Design a protein around this ligand. Structure first.
Ligand SMILES: [Cu+2]
Ligand SMILES: [Cu+2]
Ligand SMILES: [Cu+2]
Ligand SMILES: [Cu+2]
Ligand SMILES: [Cu+2]
Ligand SMILES: [Cu+2]
Ligand SMILES: [Cu+2]
Ligand SMILES: [Cu+2]
Ligand SMILES: [Cu+2]
Ligand SMILES: [Cu+2]
Ligand SMILES: [Cu+2]
Ligand SMILES: [Cu+2]
Ligand SMILES: [Cu+2]
Ligand SMILES: [Cu+2]
Ligand SMILES: [Cu+2]
Ligand SMILES: [Cu+2]
Ligand SMILES: [Cu+2]
Ligand SMILES: [Cu+2]
Lengths: 294, 294, 294
C-alpha cells in the first residue's frame, strides 16, 4: 500500500475509564506500526494502538462498553468486533474511515476470555496483518478455584504470514507462530507477538505456586494444542466460563478464537516451557518460558 | 470417469415414512449431479439424491432405520454409513452396485447431530466428491433448554477440492469451504454447499429470539471453529447429546464429522455473519448470514 | 547423520519394577532402529527401546517414577519428558549424552492417558523421527464405568514425514498418518506406527462386548478426529481423567498430545474400522480394524 510506505505510527496507550457501576469507556486507535516479529524481521503491522496483538481490555460481567475507535490509518477503513458482546454486526461493528472516529455501545454479559479483532472486509486480511487481541470479562462470582491461585498472567497465540499477501493468508502455512503476554497488574510484562521475547525474558513465578493463565488463540487460521511442560492443568475453564470445568488435562484444544482459563502448580525450581504441542508451530516460534525460583 | 461425461441426474426427493412406533423407512439414491459450488464453478458431484451435502434425515431416539440405497451411478459402487447407528460395517455399510438397490437395517439409539456419508473405498474420494450429510436423532426427553428456543435451523460445513483429484484430496488445501442449510420445517431453506447462497439469501430471525442451530462439520479433512458474530452461545450440547452441556462459549471446536446443538440470542436488528473462525476457510466461502428484523 | 549410516539397533525390552507401594523403577533406551512404516518403506527411526511409538508404560496414580534413560545413539543426545509428571524441565528433562545414562525422579499424581517424548532441542525433530509414546496413570478409584467394560486396548496415532527433513517437519503435509497398539495384558498385540499392521491383523473382540480404548494422539503436528465406524462412544473421559466425562459422542477431538479413554459397544459380528475422520490422514494410513466374532 503506497500510503503505508515509510509509515510507523508510535504506539498510543489504551484509554479506559469507568463511568458508572456497570458502564465503561474504552478508546483505541487503528494504526500502522513496525513490529519485530522474529530477530531481524520487521512486519509493518495493522494494529490497535501500535501493539499486535492489541492491548488487553478487562471489564466486569454486566458492563456496557462505550467503545470509540480512532482510525489513524491514512487509507484503509477499520472496525472492531469484540467476541464478549451482544451487538448488531451490521450496525455496531461497522467501519470507521481514515482520520475519523466512531463510537459504539454494547453489553458484555458473559464471563470469559474473548477474542477481539477488526471486522473490515476481507476480515482475514485485517486479522492476519495484526488486528487482533483479547478482552477478559471477570465473572460476577469468580471461579471456584480463585482462592487457590497465587499468580496470574495473560498469554495470546497468533500467526504471522508473508506481508499483506492474501494468497499466503488463505493457502499458505504460517511463517511464524508466536505467544505474547499482556499485563494484568503493574509490573507484569506487556509484549507483542514475536518468536523470542518470552524466551529471553521469561514470565516469573515462585516454587510451589499455583499459576492461572488467561489464554486465547486468535489465529487467524490455526488451532492450538496448549501445554505447559513439567505440569498438568489442575483446572481448566473453557472460554473462561466457570461452568465449563475440566480437571487434570495435559493439553487444552483451542479453536481459532478460542480461549480458556487454566491453572497449574509449579513444584520445583527451573524453567518451564509453554508451547503449542503442534510442534511445527512451536518450532516456528510458539514457545514461551516460565522461570520458577525459590 | 468417461461414464460420467455429460451426466447430470436431476435431484430426486428423499423418501421417508414411519412404519411403526419405533421403525422408519428411508429411501435415498446415489447419483451424479452438477452443483454450482462458487459463482461460475460447476462441480459434477457424487451425491445422495442430487444434493451435496445430502438431504436431511430426522428420526427419534430409539428408531430402527430400514434404509434403502438405489445406486444410479452408471459405473461406481456406493454405500451408506450413518454415524447415528450401531451396525456391522462389513455387513451393513456395504456397496450397492450400479443400477442396483440394497436395504440395510439398524437402530439409532443415541440422540444427537450425526454425520452420514458413503463408505466405499477410498472413502476420502467418496466424501470429497460430495457424498456426505447429516442425520439428527431427537432425544426422547428433549434438551433442558427446549422451552427457551424460538427458532431453529440446520447448518452443515464441508470443503471442495480440485475435481476428483485424489492427490489434492490427500495433500492439498481446500479450494472452497462452505455452509449449507437443510430444512426442518416447511418454508425453511434447503441449499447445497456453496460460497454464496446463504450470503445472498440469509437465514431469517426476529429481534430478541433465541436461535438453535444444529450443526455438523462433515469435512472431509478440516476441523471447524464455529462462531456467530455479535453473540455468545448461551448453551452448547456437544454432538447434540443433552448431557454434554457447555455454557457461554464464543466458538465451538468441531472435529471432522463433529456435531453440536448451539443456542444464542440475537438482541438487535441487523445481519449476523456465521463463520468458521479459521479465517482462511471463511475467506474461501465459509460465511453464512442471519438477517434479524423487527 | 553419518554416524547413523548402517545402524540398526535391535529392540531392547522395557524394564520396569515396583520398588515400593508408591514407587516404580523404569529403564528405557534411546536407540536408532529401522521400522517399516508402509509397505516397502523403511524409516531409520529415533526411538525409545527400538519401537515407535515407544513401549507402553502403566503406573498407578500416586506413583513416583525413578526413570533411567540409557542413550545408545552414537552421536545425538536424547531426553525424556513424561506429560504425566510434575517436574522441573530444566533439571529433570535434561539431555543424556551418547553412551551415557541419566536417572530422574518425579511423581505421577494425575490419572489419565499421557504422551511422553524426547525433549531435546529441536523437539520437533526428535518427536518427528519417532521419539514419542504413551504412559497411562490408573486412577485410584477407577472410572465409573469400569464394571461395564469387557475388553480393552491401547491405540496411538502419529505421523511420519520425509526422513529427518526439518523443512518438511515444519512446512509439509505428513507422508503417512498411522495407528499402533501397545499391549496391556499378555497376548495383546504390540505394534509400531505403520500403515498396515492393524488392517492385516485386526484387534479382536466378541459380539456384544463393551470395548475401552486408551487413546493418544502424539502428533507431532496434527489434531485427530477419532472415530470407530459402526458405533457411538457411550462414554468418553478427556485425557483419561474420570471427571471429564462426555456421553454419546460420535467423534472425539484430540489435540496434538491429547488423550482420552473411550468406551463403545460392538453389537454385531463384522470388521469395524477405526479412523481419524480427517480423511486425508485416514487415506495416508490412519485406519485400524477391530474384528468382532461370535
Ligand atoms: Cu449494580
Ligand atoms: Cu458513555
Ligand atoms: Cu482493520
Ligand atoms: Cu471474530
Ligand atoms: Cu497451517
Ligand atoms: Cu499456593
Ligand atoms: Cu414405544
Ligand atoms: Cu421395514
Ligand atoms: Cu460413494
Ligand atoms: Cu464416518
Ligand atoms: Cu487445509
Ligand atoms: Cu425468546
Ligand atoms: Cu500407600
Ligand atoms: Cu529408585
Ligand atoms: Cu531425542
Ligand atoms: Cu510434550
Ligand atoms: Cu497437515
Ligand atoms: Cu458386556
Amino acid at each position: 500500500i503506497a500510503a503505508h510506505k515509510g509509515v510507523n505510527q508510535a504506539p498510543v496507550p489504551l484509554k479506559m475509564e469507568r463511568v458508572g457501576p456497570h458502564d465503561v469507556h474504552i478508546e483505541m486507535t487503528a494504526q500502522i506500526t513496525d513490529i519485530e516479529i522474529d530477530k531481524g524481521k520487521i512486519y509493518k503491522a495493522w494494529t490497535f494502538n501500535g501493539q499486535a496483538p492489541g492491548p488487553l481490555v478487562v471489564v466486569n460481567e454486566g458492563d456496557t462498553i462505550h467503545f470509540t475507535l480512532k482510525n489513524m490509518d491514512p487509507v484503509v477503513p477499520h472496525s472492531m468486533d469484540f467476541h464478549a458482546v451482544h451487538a448488531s454486526p451490521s450496525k455496531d461493528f461497522i467501519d470507521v474511515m481514515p482520520n475519523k472516529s466512531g463510537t459504539f455501545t454494547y453489553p458484555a454479559n458473559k464471563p470469559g476470555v474473548f477474542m477481539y479483532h477488526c471486522g473490515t472486509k476481507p476480515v482475514l486480511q485485517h486479522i492476519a496483518n495484526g488486528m487482533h487481541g483479547v478482552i477478559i470479562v471477570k465473572p460476577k462470582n469468580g471461579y471456584p478455584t480463585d482462592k487457590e491461585v497465587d499468580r496470574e498472567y495473560v498469554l495470546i497465540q497468533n500467526e504471522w504470514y508473508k506481508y499483506n499477501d492474501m494468497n499466503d493468508f488463505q493457502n499458505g502455512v504460517p511463517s511464524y507462530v508466536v505467544f505474547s503476554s499482556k499485563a494484568l497488574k503493574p509490573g507484569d510484562p506487556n509484549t507483542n507477538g514475536d518468536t523470542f521475547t518470552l524466551k529471553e525474558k521469561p514470565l516469573l513465578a515462585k516454587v510451589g505456586e499455583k499459576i492461572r493463565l488467561y489464554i486465547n488463540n486468535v489465529g487467524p487460521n490455526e488451532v492450538s494444542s496448549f501445554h505447559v511442560v513439567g505440569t498438568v492443568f489442575d483446572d481448566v475453564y473453557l472460554d473462561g466460563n466457570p461452568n465449563n470445568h475440566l480437571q487434570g488435562m495435559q493439553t487444552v484444544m483451542l479453536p481459532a478464537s478460542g480461549g480458556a482459563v487454566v491453572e497449574f502448580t509449579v513444584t520445583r525450581p527451573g524453567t518451564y516451557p509453554i508451547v503449542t504441542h503442534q510442534f511445527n508451530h512451536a518450532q516456528k516460534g510458539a514457545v514461551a518460558m516460565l522461570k520458577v525460583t525459590e
